[PDB]
Amino acid sequence: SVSKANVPKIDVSPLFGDDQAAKMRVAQQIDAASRDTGFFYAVNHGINVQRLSQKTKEFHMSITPEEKWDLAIRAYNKEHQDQVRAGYYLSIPGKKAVESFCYLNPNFTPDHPRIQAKTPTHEVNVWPDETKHPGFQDFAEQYYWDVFGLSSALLKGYALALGKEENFFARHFKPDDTLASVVLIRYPYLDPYPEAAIKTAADGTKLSFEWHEDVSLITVLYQSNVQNLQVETAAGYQDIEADDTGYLINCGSYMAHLTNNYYKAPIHRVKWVNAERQSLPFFVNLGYDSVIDPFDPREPNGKSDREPLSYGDYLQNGLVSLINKNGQT
Ligand SMILES: N[C@@H](CCCC(=O)N[C@@H](CS)C(=O)NCC(=O)O)C(=O)O
Ligand SMILES: [Fe+2]
Structure with missing residues (x-):
């Protein structure tokens, strides 16, 4: 149904x-x-x-x-x-x-000014031993830059869509300072699948991860070809089809803040599926001190009754809140 x-x-x-x-x-x-x-x-x-x-x-x-x-x-x-x-x-x-x-x-890197300053949300990546995982670090770092490139292009489209110049978001999304992350998620096949690792939604749906809005400007997601995501709409939660050739894109709550909820951060969740699969999000985050002035594209002067929020404030608060709400992943 x-x-x-x-x-x-x-x-x-x-x-x-x-x-x-x-x-x-x-x-x-x-x-x-x-x-x-x-x-x-x-x-x-x-x-x-x-x-x-x-x-x-x-x-x-x-x-x-x-x-x-x-x-x-x-x-x-x-x-x-x-x-x-x-x-x-x-x-x-x-x-x-x-x-x-x-x-x-x-x-x-160790010498980066934000690493030296110990600013929250900045860290030096950790990697497995190269001889045990040959080529993995190099591949993963290049992947960061490939998906950064795609995300920059998407950000030009969102800016144009909102009646702005194409660099409106992208000018804040810079190699030297972006807080963006890659997550390489493994969801296992298990026989038996322990019930303790399955959550149940109010509507009875079995879940691996509960309802949430993303903590991002946008999210740029690759998944295996196994259907799993659902989005809350007005006629209920609906299944998002898998497509392992495409990237699934949605807004996060910073976009909702900047646009005065004209582009909402959709509410979505992850169904439990007993399948060996991958979920590989890129969270498009700005720089720590990036501030975009909020606006409203449904109002004639574009004015919004929201206050400017720096991205770093947003991100640290959001990631902590999501762990409290939906559990440590
Ligand atoms: N550690 C990451 C942030 C991870 C935020 C998070 O938990 N995301 C969930 C919900 S969007 C997810 O990626 N879910 C994917 C899935 O398949 O479940 C970082 O520090 O930037
Ligand atoms: Fe999400």
Whole structure:
């Protein structure tokens, strides 16, 4: 009885080029999707997602329990007090099925000014031993830059869609300072699948991750071809079809803040599925001190009754709140 959500496939390739008319026609499609269910698939995006999937699989299936402790975030290993965001997020057999590896901007090096200053939300990535995972760090860092590139193009489309100049968001999304993250999530097949690792929604649906708005400007997501996501709409939660050739795009709550809820952050959740699969989000985050002045594209003077919020304030508050609401991942 759970209807397919309207999730259009938008050819985003004009956003990489210089045909302004064509870009406006893509922006209209982004506007439409953003006003409807809040999701679309970006197609013709130029990223080799099959290779991303293969390299990620090789990592997930070769990492050992020893390596996971050695890379673990603070929530799992008290010795790693600097690792709030970046590192390994362990499963707990019998209790918690999902496990993952998160990394941040590769430019956050020991000498980076924000690392020196110890500013919250900035960390130096941790990586497994190169000889045990040959090529993995290099692949993963290049992937960061490939999806950064796609996200910059998408941000040009969102800006045009909102009646702005195309750099309105992108000017704040910079290699030297972006707080964006990649998460390489493994969802396992388990037989038996422990009930303790399954949540139940109010409507009785079995879930792996509860309802939420994303903490992002936008989210740029690759998933395996196994249906799992649902979006809350007015006729109920609806199934978002999988498409392992496309990137699933949606707004996060910073976009809702900037646009005075004209582009809402859609509410969505992750169904429980007993399948070995991947979920690989890129969270498009700005710089720590990036402030965009809020506006309202439904009002004649564009004025909004929201206050400016720096991205760093937003992000630290949001990530902590999401862990309190929906649990440590
Ligand atoms: N550690 C990350 C933030 C992770 C936020 C989070 O928990 N996201 C969920 C909800 S959007 C997710 O990615 N879910 C994916 C899925 O498949 O469940 C970072 O420091 O930036
Ligand atoms: Fe999400």
